[PDB]
């Protein structure tokens, strides 16, 4: 009855406590080690709960809600977790005071719809506001994500690369399609942008002075054959006593590799790619017939090529034909930092691309790897929904005044419950104050009073310890995704408060 609910209030808070310091771009990291002893360190809240594997029953309720927030959005699942826990925290003293739990479900269901009516009424459409080209607006919203970082001096260069990566793709946008490579050496402004698929190309075997790097419409072959001479896959050794038999044995070792190689020429492959390495003996046969050979391709890069060229990856060589051979328009090789890089540009299905960073350290590319995933989604959700609201916990402060002022006119038990729903929304900006090292006392006390004075978009400035209009600063977040999160948190809490007794089959 009553005590089983209090056990579920605290059983969910420890889950929120596991990802409490991850809210915001500048959140804290954790260290979760699996059974094999592998180290996994990430600030993403969804990845923490995936590996914890909490066996508690009331804890798995929020895990199922977070997975739905990740499947649809892929970001912001922590905000669903901390808010779902705070709805249980503020109602904790009211549960033990004799109030029924079902009455609370009517309050959250009442305040949740009241938030959607206020969010849609306050969100502002931004398509061509202020007479500005959208390339500048997408650059303005993107550069603010890169400020206060190691690349703050040359952020304008990197800010222009993201708008070029999205416009090169079709109307369907996807964050996984745009791959990011890391290459150590060089300055920050020397970072290149590839519209097609590319790989590191660690192939350093023979095949020099031939294998032209230009092609009109080459047939990209995707194989998994190790064409090395002394390969672990192809070999021939027959132990006998006859001497004349050994000449046929050494000839059979070269025929296994060579007979399989003739299938590559008869199939029509112009640019032959293979995951396993290719020996210097096989590269010469490609060089004699004027064929391009480049192996040591990762398996992940070929999956981006399979979506780009439109072919298929075959393990066997006998099945190589025109069915799996893709096509492209511009296939050329570059010299980024002196290292070789092959890439296919202008494919029919060019839905993916590649982006190579540069710098004199391995860690400067790590922080850049994280910031780019945040700038792409802003451009992805800005064109998807022109009606958006201010970021930095600004939308959470609007509902605190509206729902509270609305609760002051709703007599009955729904008052303190919808009123407590207002104070429960203060957990989002309070964590941005703590997860950034700022004083949450001065900010929330100065931020909440700004709205009564006339504030409507003021929020927590993650850069400086002060308040700022996040809408004017182009720190925007979607209005509908905020509604999908509040509806997810309200459904997450209402399922817990709806439970009053735990039943377990004895096993």
């Amino acid at each position: 009855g009553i005590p089983q609910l209090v056990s579920n209030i605290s059983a969910c808070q420890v889950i929120a406590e596991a990802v409490r310091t991850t809210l915001g771009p500048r959140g804290m990291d954790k260290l979760i080690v699996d059974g094999r002893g592998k180290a996994t360190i990430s600030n993403d809240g969804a990845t923490i709960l995936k590996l914890l594997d909490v066996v508690h029953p009331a804890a798995k309720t929020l895990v199922d809600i977070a997975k739905s927030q990740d499947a649809e959005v892929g970001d912001g699942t922590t905000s669903v977790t901390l808010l779902a826990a705070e709805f249980l925290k503020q109602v904790k003293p009211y549960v033990e005071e004799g109030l029924h739990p079902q009455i609370i479900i009517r309050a959250f269901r009442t305040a949740t719809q009241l938030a959607v009516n206020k969010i849609k009424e306050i969100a502002v459409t931004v398509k061509k506001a202020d007479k500005v080209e959208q390339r500048k607006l997408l650059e303005k919203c993107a550069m603010t994500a890169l400020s206060s970082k190691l690349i703050s001096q040359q952020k304008a260069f990197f800010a222009k690369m993201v708008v070029d990566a999205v416009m090169m793709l079709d109307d369907l946008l996807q964050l996984k399609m745009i791959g990011i490579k890391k290459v150590q050496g060089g300055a920050l402004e020397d970072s290149q942008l590839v519209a097609g698929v590319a790989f590191k190309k660690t192939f350093s075997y023979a095949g020099f002075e031939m294998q032209p790097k230009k092609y009109h419409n080459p047939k990209i072959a995707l194989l998994n054959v190790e064409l090395e001479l002394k390969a672990e896959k192809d070999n021939a050794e027959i132990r006998v006593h006859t001497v004349e038999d050994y000449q046929a044995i050494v000839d059979a070792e070269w025929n296994i590799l060579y007979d399989k190689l003739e299938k590559i020429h008869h199939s029509g492959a112009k640019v032959v790619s293979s995951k396993l390495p290719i020996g210097d003996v096989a590269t010469q046969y490609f060089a004699d017939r004027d064929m391009f050979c480049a192996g040591r391709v990762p398996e992940e890069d070929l999956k981006r090529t399979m979506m780009a060229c439109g072919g298929s990856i075959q393990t066997s060589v006998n099945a190589l034909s025109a069915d799996v051979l893709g096509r492209c328009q511009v296939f050329e090789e570059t010299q980024i930092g002196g290292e070789r890089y092959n890439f296919f540009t202008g494919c029919p299905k060019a839905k993916t691309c590649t982006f190579i960073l540069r710098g004199g350290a391995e860690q400067f590319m790590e922080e850049t790897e994280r910031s780019l995933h945040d700038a792409i989604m802003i451009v992805r959700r800005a064109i998807k929904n022109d009606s958006v609201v201010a970021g930095g916990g600004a939308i959470e402060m609007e509902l605190s005044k509206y729902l509270r002022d609305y609760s002051r006119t709703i007599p009955g038990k729904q008052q303190l419950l919808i009123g407590a729903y207002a104070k429960a929304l203060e957990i989002i900006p309070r964590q941005l104050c703590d997860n950034a090292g700022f004083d949450a006392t001065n900010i929330l006390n100065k931020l909440r009073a700004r709205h009564a004075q006339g504030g409507t978009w003021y929020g927590v400035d993650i850069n400086n310890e002060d308040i700022a209009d996040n809408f004017e600063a182009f720190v925007w977040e979607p209005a509908m995704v905020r509604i999908n999160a509040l509806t997810a948190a309200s459904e997450a809490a209402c399922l817990i408060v709806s439970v009053d007794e735990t039943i377990k089959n004895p096993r």
């Binding site: 406590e17 596991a18 310091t21 500048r26 804290m28 990291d29 954790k30 260290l31 979760i32 080690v33 699996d34 059974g35 180290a39 360190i41 914890l52 594997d53 023979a206 020099f208 001479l229 002394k230 050794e237 027959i238 132990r239 006593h241 006859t242 001497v243 004349e244 050994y246 000449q247 044995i249 050494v250 000839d251 070792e253 070269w254 020996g279 210097d280 003996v281 010469q284 002196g338 350290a361 391995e362 860690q363 703590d434 997860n435 950034a436 090292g437």
Partner: protein, 512 residues
Amino acid sequence: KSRLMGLEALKSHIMAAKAVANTMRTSLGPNGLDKMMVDKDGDVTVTNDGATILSMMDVDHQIAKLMVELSKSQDDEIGDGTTGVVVLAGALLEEAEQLLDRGIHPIRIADGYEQAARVAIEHLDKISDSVLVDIKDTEPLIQTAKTTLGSKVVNSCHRQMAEIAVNAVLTVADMERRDVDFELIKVEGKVGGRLEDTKLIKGVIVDKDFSHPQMPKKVEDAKIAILTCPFEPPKPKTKHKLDVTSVEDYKALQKYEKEKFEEMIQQIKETGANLAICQWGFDDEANHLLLQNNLPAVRWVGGPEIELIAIATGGRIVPRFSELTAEKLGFAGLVQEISFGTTKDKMLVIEQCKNSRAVTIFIRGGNKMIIEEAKRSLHDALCVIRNLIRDNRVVYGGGAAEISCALAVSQEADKCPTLEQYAMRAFADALEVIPMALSENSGMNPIQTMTEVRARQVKEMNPALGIDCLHKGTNDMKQQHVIETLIGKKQQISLATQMVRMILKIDDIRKP
């Protein structure tokens, strides 16, 4: 499962790292106390290497495991000052423990250390000094690295190894490019010889000899045939396992030999090949026929070693005798043999007779552990020459620049009105612990020795002076010519701060 939050979680991680700090606080510098390490096989090694300590330190605490990954990239990035990053990484948390009691969040300390690290890097570029500016020579380049090899067992021939290190780096990389590739230098070893018998080959070298002692000791022809079997009655590659059926088949194999010893040897001249590097050795009848035609060869060459010959020579492997041709022949300037007096080595020394992009430093020595100390001292010496060509500007090592970085940071603290100023003051006092430990390892007062230099850089003169760690004449190590690289002095304060920010951003560790 583990669960710990709040300040007690931060302080538990500080002491978890301080345990490794005080462990490596004594093996710092030339007077660093050695460390006895017991391997899993029962062996016992003694050394003061910073990279070897963390490799064998099997500490189960997860905070200590982060410091092991710090040493991975630091070997190729710095190499020499491996012990200096941990004392600095540990000293920062020791003073930061005072900041956590003051009521500061760890991330603001992570921000303040990155703020002070820039005040340190910019100060290092001010006091640097070019050496090889627009001068292509090895006279000042060999002498600078000659002093760095004194803290190892190669002190008896530290002058010989310094010339080999400079001749090898200048080969695989050009001074005009300022891009020194260390992957083009391979390090081998062999039990026997001395430190002075270390050779430098611009090409490939293996511990293999020719198939007959009367072969030509000099092969000036660019004809190297890489085969998988020798020019004789062939045999398999893994195991022969000979078994005759009966006496009738026994006399027939002798007839097979007379045809094959005549068929394969004459085939070497038709393709213009002279040197036939093969996998297995030759028979006594094969070597007698090659002496008539002056055709060298090598016996019992390994599998993966033959692949390396084709990389330096650019040739191809000829797996069968049917496709013998001139295209699959190797390229080289001169292939010779080097016999070290009475020690019957007879090595295969392949060279290109020009400035190639592939060198091999074959270290010798009468003991395996002595050569083990020359490998790390040579590999650390490559990092000295790597940064010098990439940055001729260098600063004074031996604890000279660490005090200079503490003053510029303390001088810049009064002009930084923010909560990170306490971190700037703590980052200043933490930089002084690297030289303060050298004063303790030298057996002197760590406090009396530290402040006497700080007054010299202010009251006596503005340039920076070093601490007399090796019990030399006096301070001002510039006179002693003890100078480390500038990229290392910047990378030491970078990876050390970057590791502290990685720890301060962690507040809980959980494992099932």
